[PDB]
């Protein structure tokens, strides 16, 4: 966390507090009936003309949580518990799916997955990286501007704050490892059309948010920043047409008070 | 070099933090981070890949603050690294290969080499050849005087990872008989359907100290970052396949170590 002088941990009757919320997935939400899905995915006519519609693009989810006011003292995020909410829903293999074979059940949700979650004293800081720099990201999303071929591997122009929902497409932004001093981020990409979902749930697993120096994220502005993505895979419709399917993520963050100079 | 005690005090630690880009073959002005669509030799004997079909080791020499018989050297103590731009692999709509009627495109997948090293000098390479009759293309540094023994082991094929866009990945490996002064880590997963699995986190530190609590020592006040991250192949609409690479972030803690001679 750092940036300011991190002094000693204040103890007492009111030195600890808890945030506990859920973050919903923005998977593209085609129509009034498909919250948590994307629009059935289409493929560009040409490599040069890639231009996905906004409702075909999953996005990072973010939540600013206001904490009990202080004043310096700052709130220190100490522990996280998180799990994906509604894992069993992925066993619904009967809702106009693709029969895997004659008299087969539907092909279950599976394939390319990004499970990611961050706890920060400020916005998650993003670096842009593009699969194809000539991809035209659709009106209404915040995307890397002034894309060059260098954007495809690394281009330090593409910095940004995860400060808005339904905004930052997943496929062109990643945590910027050159700057998230005040955030703890964890994510995994598994790529492949047949990748099986593997989702663990438990109320027994705590993750500690303290760094090498025993300091957790420090909540600037008395704000805690929960960010998450949980693209679980794709739903295969009867036709074979595929929609990304997302799930909400639970957070419970223990916080304590840290004395700070300036 | 006899290694003496660790200097502590007001300015005894320092940090390098950079990114290394991937040299995957970079066909044309528009395809940085890809290889050229892969072709297959007419015969086993005539294997001769074009330079733009050959991923290469990436290397970066970082000059450190000046310090200096009884002298000081920078000791690399910890590394943090992750692949930058993992999410970009979810782009399944950019003229890919529909896995089936109305399917999304086949995502980047298949044969992968993720490798990274931290050294007080160049990574030291041993040459090993899949096929010793393979002619490595004009403009790459490759094993010279290939014999059939080159296919299993041939100690002639030594070299320094001292140049970018130079050393093809498929004919060089870290030389395990050397690299005293480097810490290297890599994994090959082979197979056309191997799923990419890329973890990212700013919470994972790796220690670079050996059995004796000494990290790499930066000869000439230079730190050597080497990396390869061939993530898999992009399958075009035609079925033609291009290697796809990604940048690697490094952040290395260094401290000062007293040394004789």
């Amino acid at each position, epitope marked *: 966390m750092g940036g300011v002088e991190v002094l000693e941990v204040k103890t007492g009757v009111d030195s600890i507090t808890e945030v506990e919320c859920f973050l919903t997935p923005e998977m593209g939400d085609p129509d009034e009936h498909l919250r948590g899905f994307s629009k059935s995915i289409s493929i560009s006519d*040409t490599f040069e*003309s890639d231009s996905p519609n906004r409702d075909m693009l999953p996005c990072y989810s973010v939540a600013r949580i206001p904490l009990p006011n202080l004043n310096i003292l700052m709130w220190e995020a100490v522990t996280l518990k998180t799990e994906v909410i509604g894992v069993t829903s992925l066993m619904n293999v009967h809702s106009n799916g693709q029969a895997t074979h004659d008299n087969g059940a539907g092909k279950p949700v599976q394939g390319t997955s990004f499970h990611f979650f961050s706890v920060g004293g400020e916005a998650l800081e993003l670096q842009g990286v593009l699969f194809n720099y000539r991809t035209k990201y659709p009106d209404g999303t915040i995307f890397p501007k002034n894309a060059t071929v260098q954007s495809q591997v690394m281009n330090t122009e593409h910095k940004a704050y995860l400060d808005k929902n339904k905004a930052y497409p997943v496929e062109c932004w990643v945590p910027d490892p050159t700057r998230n001093e005040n955030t703890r981020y964890f994510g995994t990409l598994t790529g492949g059309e047949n990748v099986p979902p593997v989702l663990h749930i438990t109320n027994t697993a705590t993750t500690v948010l303290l760094d090498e120096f025993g300091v957790g994220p420090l909540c600037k502005g008395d704000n805690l920043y929960l960010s998450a993505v949980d693209v679980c895979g794709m739903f295969t419709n009867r036709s074979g047409s595929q929609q990304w399917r997302g799930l909400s993520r639970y957070f419970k963050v223990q916080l304590r008070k840290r004395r700070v100079k300036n | 070099v006899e290694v003496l005690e660790v200097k502590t005090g007001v300015d005894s630690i320092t940090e390098v933090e950079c990114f290394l880009t991937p040299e995957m073959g970079d066909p044309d002005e528009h395809l940085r981070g890809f290889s050229k669509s892969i*072709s297959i030799s*007419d015969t086993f004997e005539s294997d001769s890949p074009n330079r733009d079909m050959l991923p290469c080791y990436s290397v970066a020499r970082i000059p450190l603050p000046n310090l200096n018989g009884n002298i000081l050297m920078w000791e690399a103590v910890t590394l943090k690294t992750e692949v930058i731009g993992v999410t970009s692999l979810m782009n399944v709509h950019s003229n890919g290969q529909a896995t089936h009627d109305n399917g999304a495109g086949k995502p980047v997948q298949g044969t992968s080499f993720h490798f990274f090293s931290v050294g007080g000098e160049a990574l030291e390479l041993q040459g090993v050849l899949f096929n010793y009759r393979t002619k490595y293309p004009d403009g790459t540094i490759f094993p010279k005087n290939a014999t059939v023994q080159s296919q299993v082991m041939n100690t002639e094929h030594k070299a320094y990872l001292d140049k970018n866009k130079a050393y093809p990945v498929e004919c060089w490996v870290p030389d395990p008989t050397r690299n005293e002064n480097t810490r290297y880590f890599g994994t090959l997963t082979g197979g056309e359907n191997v799923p990419p699995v890329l973890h990212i986190t700013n919470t994972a530190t790796t220690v670079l100290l050996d059995e004796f609590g000494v990290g790499p020592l930066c000869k000439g006040d230079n730190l050597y970052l080497s990396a390869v991250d061939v993530c898999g192949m992009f399958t*075009n609409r035609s*079925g033609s396949q291009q290697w796809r690479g990604l940048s690697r972030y490094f952040k290395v803690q260094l401290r000062k170590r007293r040394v004789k001679n």
Partner: antibody
């Protein structure tokens, strides 16, 4: 649909000059490398010249090295071929063709006739 | 660094005809072949791309095979509407340009 339309072709005397126009409608012309290919009456096809999306890379067939010049105006959705020092052999239908990655040369225009005679 | 295809080919309606295109490492070895179909007094049109692939609108009858430096086009279930010139094309890395074949007039 994608439509390319060539124009500017006609009758010109040896040593003569001539500017050909390709009008692109149906696609972002500014995103693709574009080609000229010609066909001498009764003979096969022969590539003339390529130009990159941003006019960074122009290439020419040897048969017209030094005489022809390719150019594009991405604002006017138009590809041009400047033909100087025209010869009898240069008589052909001049096709305008798009190159797309993986698809390679895909769409052709209707062609425009260039006859160089006395 | 020239593409060599038969100047003419022919067949009986219903037959499979095969037009070959032979190049070198500099072109077909390292670069894909597109086939273009040309009827008299019209432009060339894309028939096969990337050695072996059909754009939408080309019947299953039309097919390709690649073996190293040589490719072939296969017109199966030959029909009269298939009478025309078949053009073989591929990029050449050394000439930095497109090379074509002679053309193949298919008579039925």
């Amino acid at each position: 649909e994608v439509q390319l339309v060539e124009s500017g072709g006609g009758l010109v005397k040896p040593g003569g000059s001539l500017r050909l126009s390709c009008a692109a409608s149906g696609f972002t012309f500014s995103s693709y490398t574009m080609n000229w290919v010609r066909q001498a009456p009764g003979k096969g096809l022969q590539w003339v010249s390529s130009i990159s999306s941003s006019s960074t890379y122009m290439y020419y067939g040897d048969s017209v090295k030094g005489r022809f010049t390719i150019s594009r105006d991405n604002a006017r959705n138009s590809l041009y071929l400047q033909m100087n020092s025209l010869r009898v052999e240069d008589t052909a239908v001049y096709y305008c063709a798009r190159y797309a990655h993986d698809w390679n040369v895909d769409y052709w225009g209707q062609g425009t006739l260039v006859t160089v005679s006395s | 660094s020239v593409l060599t295809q038969p100047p003419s080919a022919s067949g009986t309606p219903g037959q499979r005809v095969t037009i070959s295109c032979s190049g070198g490492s500099s072109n077909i070895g390292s670069n894909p072949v597109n086939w273009f179909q040309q009827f008299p007094g019209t432009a060339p049109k894309l028939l096969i791309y990337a050695n072996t692939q059909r754009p939408s609108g080309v019947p299953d009858r039309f097919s390709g095979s690649k073996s190293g430096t040589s490719v072939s086009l296969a017109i199966s279930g030959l029909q009269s509407e298939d009478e025309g010139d078949y053009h073989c094309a591929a990029w050449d890395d050394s000439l930095k340009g497109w090379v074509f074949g002679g053309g193949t007039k298919l008579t039925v």
